[PDB]
Amino acid sequence: SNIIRGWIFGTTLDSKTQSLLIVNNATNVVIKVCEFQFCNDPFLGVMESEFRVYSSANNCTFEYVSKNLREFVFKNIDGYFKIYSKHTPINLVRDLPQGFSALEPLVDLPIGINITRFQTLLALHRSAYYVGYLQPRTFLLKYNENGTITDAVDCALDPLSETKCTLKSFTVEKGIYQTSNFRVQPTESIVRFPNITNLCP
Amino acid sequence: DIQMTQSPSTLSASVGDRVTITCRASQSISSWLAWYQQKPGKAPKLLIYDASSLESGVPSRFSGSGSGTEFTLTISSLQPDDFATYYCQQYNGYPWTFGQGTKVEIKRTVAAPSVFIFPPSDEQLKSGTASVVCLLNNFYPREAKVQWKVDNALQSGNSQESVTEQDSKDSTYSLSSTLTLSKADYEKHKVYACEVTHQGLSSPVTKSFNRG
Amino acid sequence: QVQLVQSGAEVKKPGASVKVSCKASGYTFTTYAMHWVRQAPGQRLEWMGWINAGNGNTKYSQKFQGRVTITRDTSASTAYMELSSLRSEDTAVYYCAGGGGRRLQFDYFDYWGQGTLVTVSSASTKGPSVFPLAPSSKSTSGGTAALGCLVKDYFPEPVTVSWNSGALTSGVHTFPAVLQSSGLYSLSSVVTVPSSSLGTQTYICNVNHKPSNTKVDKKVEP
Amino acid sequence: FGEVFNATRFASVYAWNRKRISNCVADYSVLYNSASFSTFKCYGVSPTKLNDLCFTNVYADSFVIRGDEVRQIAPGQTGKIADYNYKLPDDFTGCVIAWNSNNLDSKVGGNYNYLYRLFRKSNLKPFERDISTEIYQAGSTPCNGVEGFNCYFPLQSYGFQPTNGVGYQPYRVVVLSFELLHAPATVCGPKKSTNLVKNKCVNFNFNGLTGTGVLTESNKKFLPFQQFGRDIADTTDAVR
Amino acid sequence: GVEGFNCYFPLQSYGFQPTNGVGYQPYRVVVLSFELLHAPATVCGPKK
Ligand SMILES: *[C@@H]1O[C@H](CO)[C@@H](O)[C@H](O)[C@H]1NC(C)=O
Ligand SMILES: *[C@@H]1O[C@H](CO)[C@@H](O)[C@H](O)[C@H]1NC(C)=O
Ligand SMILES: *[C@@H]1O[C@H](CO)[C@@H](O)[C@H](O)[C@H]1NC(C)=O
Ligand SMILES: *[C@@H]1O[C@H](CO)[C@@H](O)[C@H](O)[C@H]1NC(C)=O
């Protein structure tokens, strides 16, 4: 079924500042950018009448209208809000599986919006999801001959991965490899100056 | 001054159909116009302004068009609430005028009238003026003709015609012809006849009587 | 929803003057646009003039120049119309219109008053004379015959007619009034019934002319 | 752009309206050479460069003014209309368009849909709409919301009659605005394009990919979202 | 050789009025140029 019916983004999730809203009724996706008034617990029902999500749609500056595992990567750089996505079929119902599957870019929105918070939207009962965060890492991607990413290496997991990254390969032969440097870090910043004697009269 | 005349005049239709109206102007109009709906015995309601725009709260069926001089209204499906006249207003210049009136109807198989005459009542005969009533009931065409034949002569000027308005349930029309005269003319004449010519009738039909 | 209401019926005499007025009820008065228009019966509508319910401006027509005037009262939020040197033509129904709202002025009438009836006559109140309309067996049509109740030479158009006080509803017909040369109105009302019940039933028309308070009944004798 | 310039009813100066117009593809060619605009002029940006300088956000305003008064819609002067109804910040970076139009706006005998303020207490801070009409207060007996001696109604009227002279005709004016900001722009100029020849050393340009060489047809298969290919040493060796 | 929309005259004018501010005063400018070659050296100046 489809319980996850989009997200809502922004800094305050209300009026007095702008926010994004991405929705999907049983029809199709509805991106929207206004100043809203969001229910503190916003959702949509399932008659099949719904959408107790917001109560305000002022100053709209952008509109648009038209088991399963559904991954998404959301990022926001230089006034562009990028969205990557992928739809893989699980052979389970609702547990996070294992495997490799690269996510292909979907959308690009030149909004300008500031974002600090986000939520989710669910279809109630009337008749499972995860959240990771992204950090600046360095990876080694293996490209197929058709041009798809089939494997990867995270180069900061363990010493073996840092070696694979240093050699630019997926198989290291026996040896000994210089991989990085190491240095102890200084603590504090103790300073020293001469005595405050001979004080000005 | 700006003249406004609608070539449409009266029109005909039936439920669930489309209609068109023409509003011509004696001079050039820069798409300044509006369309009003007026039911009988009520106040006008506006439909279209600036010859294109659809004003709120109306059914979506109505739609304007046209520019320059020849202007057009059009509805897709004919709902019951469409049964009334429609006027066009110009507002290109000063004194703002109106159209003539374009009135819709409810088409049905033509209904043959039933003719009736009433001699004057003797109480009326006491008063001093004579009244004669020739009646037509349930004839679907509104247009018709009635003439009076007294002592085998036609009569003019002294007759008045009053026509009902079409009923929703009946969907037909009814008519009375009245002939009035002073007593001195009454007994001077022996035989009275009103004659009606109707589209539905095969032939002109004469109904008549004499005194007593 | 904005609505407009105004005075009731009037009757006057040639040379006099009449004052009709309509009260407004709008969410804001952003230079409101009370705006008068009139209709002779069975004729083309005719436009009077527009008062600037914002302040005071008074553009008028040209066929009606120099004899009609318009004002308004701010506190009561009503519009005042005035006409003099009346004559038998101006017999009509008078209307208030206007009420733009979004922008400040238009020249199209989007809020209409429910209508005011004005009759210019030289006669005075008079009761209606009544005569029956008896049929004859000559015209026995499908075993049904027609029958009526004439009304002649009566003054104001307030001439309700009914048959046996609502006892009969079928096939009733009540024609509109007609002006005569004498300046008096006249009406004819009729109905048909199965001729089978002719000699065995009782039909009496029922007329009420309030402006003269008369109530007349007449049994029709075939 | 096409509809604003051809909207049938323009607002009066005091109630000028905006359009948060963005994320589109302007094209000033016809707008420049429509051969009908009695007054095209602007500042900050040259009339010709503006074909391509991509803009962050652009605002369009419109109204109707008296004929001669047109000059007062420009930075750094005065006039009863530019004093109380509309004035432009002296750092203005847009364009101003005006063209004569009584054939649409001057209802014969007199138009009265167009009103403009005459009396206000303060000169008008740039870029504000002050709709609420206020009765002017002068010296003794200050008057608010009332008509009488020492009380003046602010909204006068234009009597736009076609019998007037050129100096008093009505003019539909529209004014634009452009600015340069941080976040990447969203309204750029139309991009010139051309046919593609193969098997010759050319100077190519695909969307911003710029180089020179000879283009042939290939046996690669990108992924629907992939726009160009590159090899080891990161040189471009294919394109879409 | 015509005047109209899109038809300008290239030579504008300075309205050098003394009532102007410093920013719009007129300035007489003179500019010099020097170079080196293989022989001329005809203009040396004082140095005895
Ligand atoms: C789905 O939601 C959008 C959100 O505004 C709405 O525009 C659209 O009409 C909805 N679908 C239907 C069938 O109403
Ligand atoms: C945003 O909406 C508020 C309230 O509706 C309004 O005051 C404000 O002017 C709007 N923003 C802009 C840029 O018009
Ligand atoms: C986002 O918020 C920060 C708060 O530090 C503010 O400085 C910044 O201007 C905001 N973004 C934009 C585009 O204004
Ligand atoms: C995609 O890759 C597979 C295996 O790498 C290959 O067999 C196939 O030819 C490629 N192209 C397709 C499927 O169009």
Residue numbers in the entry:
A (entry chain B): 98 to 143, 153 to 172, 187 to 247, 264 to 337
B (entry chain L): 1 to 212
C (entry chain H): 1 to 222
D (entry chain A): 338 to 577
E (entry chain C): 482 to 529
Question: What does the original paper state about this entry?
Answer:
Here, we report on the isolation and characterization of a broad, potent, and protective antibody, P36-5D2, isolated from a SARS-CoV-2 convalescent individual and capable of neutralizing the major VOCs such as the Alpha, Beta, and Gamma variants. Through crystal and electron cryo-microscopy (cryo-EM) structure analyses, P36-5D2 was found to target a conserved epitope on the RBD of the spike protein, bypassing the three key mutations (K417N, E484K, and N501Y) responsible for immune escape from many potent neutralizing mAbs. Based on the binding specificity, P36-5D2 was closest to the class III RBD-targeting mAbs, including REGN10987, S309, C110, and C135 (8, 27, 30, 41). Similar to REGN10987 and S309, P36-5D2 barely competed with ACE2 for binding to RBD, suggesting that their mechanism of neutralization may involve immunoglobulin G (IgG)-mediated spike crosslinking on virions, steric hindrance, or aggregation of virions.
We went further to determine the cryo-EM structures of the P36-5D2 Fab bound to the SARS-CoV-2 spike trimer at 3.7-Å resolution. In one model, P36-5D2 Fabs bound two “up” RBDs and one “down” RBD. In the other model, P36-5D2 Fabs bound two “down” RBDs and one “up” RBD of the spike trimer. Consistent with the crystal structure analysis, the cryo-EM structure clearly demonstrated that the mutant residues K417N, E484K, and N501Y were not involved in the P36-5D2 epitope. Furthermore, P36-5D2 and ACE2 only had two overlapping residues at G446 and Y447, which was sufficient to exert spatial hindrance in disrupting the interaction between ACE2 and RBD. These results collectively revealed the highly conserved nature of the P36-5D2 epitope and provided a molecular basis for its broad and potent neutralizing activity against all the SARS-CoV-2 VOCs and mutant strains tested here. Crystal and cryo-EM structural analyses showed that P36-5D2 recognized a highly conserved epitope on RBD, which is accessible in both “up” and “down” conformations and able to withstand the mutated residues K417N, E484K, and N501Y that compromised many neutralizing mAbs, including some approved for EUA.
